[model samples]
Target: LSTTTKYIFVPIATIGCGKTTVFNTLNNLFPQWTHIQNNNISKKAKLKICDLTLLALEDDDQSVVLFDRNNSASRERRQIFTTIDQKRDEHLDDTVDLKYIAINFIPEDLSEEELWDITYNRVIQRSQLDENLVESVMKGFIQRYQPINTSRSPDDQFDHVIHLKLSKDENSLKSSLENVRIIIDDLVQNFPDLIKEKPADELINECFQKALDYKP
Candidate 1:
């Protein structure tokens, strides 16, 4: 099936939750897998993230694409499915089967306060912005976030959902490493042929360290 099918990994998360760190760690481990950042693409770009995902799948070496965006809202999730369905044929071959895997970054038990605490701490470390501005923006995203309901339309369309644990450990890097490990295990189990071997834990930790330290 690996020969015939391609995969797109979408993260369902808010402003923080180490989505990019997880994505970057995985990218570092698997250089062949395409990692597309929505931030790199202009908001007005004609080719949306979903469109770029399909285009990446067209390449021979790229069987997997990590669509790195905080698709926290149901509408954002819907846009991915709808756009991919609409434009897949334009970029991918007819025989190539595309599967959507949702990386559930927010655990079911996670509370809003915990979410706010974790995200705010991480966000402040990375960017220099007014406290009020960051507060409102992060709060808005938390308020607007719609958890992935697989029983519903767009979310239901996901072939698989990889649940990630948002550890409350004060050491953010440690939690991020745990998340990176979880993703690796999930892919190895679910997409066996694609991620056949787990990269060494030492290497995984090293990459995650570098990813966390990365400013860009």
Candidate 2:
């Protein structure tokens, strides 16, 4: 019998780097696969991968876990990975296979103007603050914004690092969706052991197409 491995895909990004868009695509494409959205893995969940894997172990069955807001320095992620590995060894059965995949969707031409637009719009949509308050908050948020380095690692690094950039002709929205599809396809094909019990091809294809339609 083939040994089933656990695959963890962490879609890393700051506020507007299209992390959710990619996750939505993946969730829609693979309906048979379980998707746990930012739940407390330590308390309510069993299948935890990526950063949370540092805290828990998943079942033997194949699973594609996507972490929505997990972008951080390689050093930070490595610490988390080390902790998780240690925890799993101490508690879980030795047969479970654990793997890590990091997904980075960074547009090549992100301009300051676009950043301001997205930031201002997001703030306005989420709050009922007056103009003065909104303006004040937006300024601070922008000031605090820092570009994340998805490439460096402290010790144990990602098994797969996919850098997604927009196609030259593809609009930002269209390019983002297309890149997400590519990433999902790669995950299904490369990490089949992570979902060994199921036919990953069908599920991945289904989720990829459905995610393209998600709007918000």
Candidate 3:
């Protein structure tokens, strides 16, 4: 008999792909499992797994690890996935089941004017990076944008994927929220075993509530 182990869902997406929104929705719907907010400790813990070589460690059961805003093959991306994968392979006796949930948004619907406006507004809200830096980053992203040829099979590289498209009838914010809800529902249904131990439904509902509370 095959023993069913717990599953970990790692959600991946580029900035503005609504990772936090999806995470929030899932957390609210399934509140029982501990929700570790993205931070240094959580980040390091993931890396620690790679250093060990045991197949089935005491810590390998009943947990849903959600990685948020973990995109970018640059310095930022390496800090997360690379470290985690290394640890999982080095220590764990049995291969860990790591699921990648790629979140994509509709790039085609964004016009130059709209993109600029959104970028400007984002800068104003955070005021973190200077205008010049923001411009440089935005330019790089624009240059990197590649056309999606759906003719090719969906990349099997990702364990699971969710595409959030902006709807013409719905406002941008509403569409984003809806996309989050869909992801949350999918996670709950697909990984019911992980969620069954706790009141997952209520937790997911709370995340949606938090999203609604967010003014932006």
Candidate 4:
């Protein structure tokens, strides 16, 4: 039911930042996949879970692994991806890089809680999130949110990192692809500090304002 794929995908981001939309796209395209929520689990257990993913899709040629980083230790987060990447290499026998799409966003502004609040609302709005989910996520953010800030490097964490900055659908209501670059330029100027590459000047729209694309 799906095309055979040589590459596996890992969108490196937290809740409601286009990961859901991309997963939907992959699910529609691939017949075999599994979504694993590896939050608050043992390191050894997490590795076993990664092994289980491969087993789950052994029969399907183009299988995929869907995972989240909701409640895991920072070391565990890196471990999960590493194990998956290692196993995928053992099976695939190809040179395809395990693609990573690190969705850029401001996780927190400790000094400017007001600005953080604006970002918090916008992120949760993207998925029409649940209150309980919000509490859990923000709790985690307060304790450990090591986004790809000025100090962090994407090279050490991910290969083939893809970044996207987006704007509201309303602004583009009266436009089309013709204004795509124009809108990107507009947001590129207004991006917040946590977005990395300060003063981001662009945006990317994949869905045709498809509600389901951002639907919860």
Candidate 5:
């Protein structure tokens, strides 16, 4: 419990999962946290993640580093995962590997039909951003289809992976926010050190406000 661990919150999900929503909430709170900008998730054989995943500008503090990880196009997920683990291991051994927290955003476990609609809407809207963005999103959807399904339980096998499980309800938007609240509570309780100095209750309520008005 008294560990000097930073964070590398790797949010994994498909087009619909509230993965983005969760990241957005935390981003609003911690601007310094690394963000996986549009199309950052890729599957390069020589995918050296940490070097590309430097902390925020002038964020000299080496203790904390939150990253939104994504690397699709691998039926052999272990290849990617093992590589990441090696990268993390390499860092911890020589350099500093920020405390890892693979914030696994499990795809909506309920309302199978609704999940499609949400993913579709997201793709359509995001596709308009650019050709490559659309391609990347679709590529992830296509290639990572089996991988994502297989990775439904990728919490362990790494350093720290937090599974933010959610149950879908009739009210899509409302239930999403409710689940977001659940996730926030989980994060706060599990990682109390992250919410240091600040009043936990006040901080949590503030986070919920974002979830309350969360679009996705």
Candidate 6:
């Protein structure tokens, strides 16, 4: 393990993809890792989400920053790498290294109808848009979304890409728990330095249960 290398986990997902749930759960289990919600960042902060990520990594104890954004387009993913490359020197030491990890929540094989069904149900549980308007709004996101293509330039920059399945289970929260477990296992297998051991299964479930209850 390279002690000076920092990792950023970026999510490639669309609206209602349960990214926040997974990110929140991961943070609960790993306090050392920072989770920054792009929507939560004030308008003034804007695209500075990348800067915030770098700032968090600058801290001695923080090695991972989970950047919670629906980077559904190739352009959006490019912005992350571009901004980080442009401003990294200002926030992080020259000697430190940074790596990007794509936590892909959308599977290419899933049909748009299935994607919409899963996402629409999740969105209504959280958003206030009128039924008629919200459906169109969400459909727009689904139509615009581009799957993660590691073969491409910006996405290819990701050192690791962990694919997570969208849960179609009757219980949405249970599906979140499953994805959370998948993330933990991947991290343990690939980045042992960051996750020395997996927490007990019961602990993961407990944390995820609390995470699903989050309103904001």
Index of the highest-TM-score prediction? 1
lDDT of 6 by residue, 88-132 (tens): 998877778898989999887988888888899878867335687
Give TM-scores for every candidate, taking all chains together and pairing residue i with residue i.
0.92, 0.62, 0.58, 0.49, 0.59, 0.92
Which ten-residue region of model 3 has the weakest summed lDDT? 49-58
Model 1 RMSD in Å is 2.1
Q: Stretches of candidate 6 above 4 Å error?
A: 1-3, 127-129, 170-173
Model 6: lDDT of residue 196: 76
Considering lDDT, which of the candidate structures 1 and 2 is the better prediction for this target? 1
- Candidate 2 vs candidate 3: which has greater TM-score? 2
Query: Model 2 shows how many backbone clashes?
Result: 9
Scored against the true structure, residue 26 in model 5 reaches a CA lDDT of 63
Deviation in angstroms for 143 in model 2?
7.0
lDDT value, candidate 5, whole model: 0.51
Q: Model 5: per-residue lDDT, tens digit, 96-160?
A: 43544555554435344554555556546543467668657655564464334334534344455
lDDT of 1 by residue, 145-179 (tens): 99999998879999999899886666544787888
Question: Which digits, one per residue and each the tens of the lDDT, describe model 2 over residues 21-120?
Answer: 5677666755444454553356545554443543333454434566655443344456546766667666446666667776765444666566566545
Residue 120 lDDT (model 4):
60
Worst 10 residues of 6 by lDDT: 167-176
RMSD of 5: 5.8
Q: RMSD (Cα, Å) of candidate 2?
A: 5.6
lDDT of 3 by residue, 1-216 (tens): 134343334433333444565566666665533333443345546433222212223254434545554333333333444565566655444544555455555455667565555545544454436767877765565444443323442333445656565443244345556776566556568766554444454554566778556664
- Sorted on TM-score, best first, the list reads 1, 6, 2, 5, 3, 4
Worst 10 residues of 4 by lDDT: 193-202
lDDT of 4 at 211: 24
Off by over 4 Å in 3: 1-12, 31-62, 70-85, 106-129, 138-155, 167-173, 188-194, 197-206, 211-216
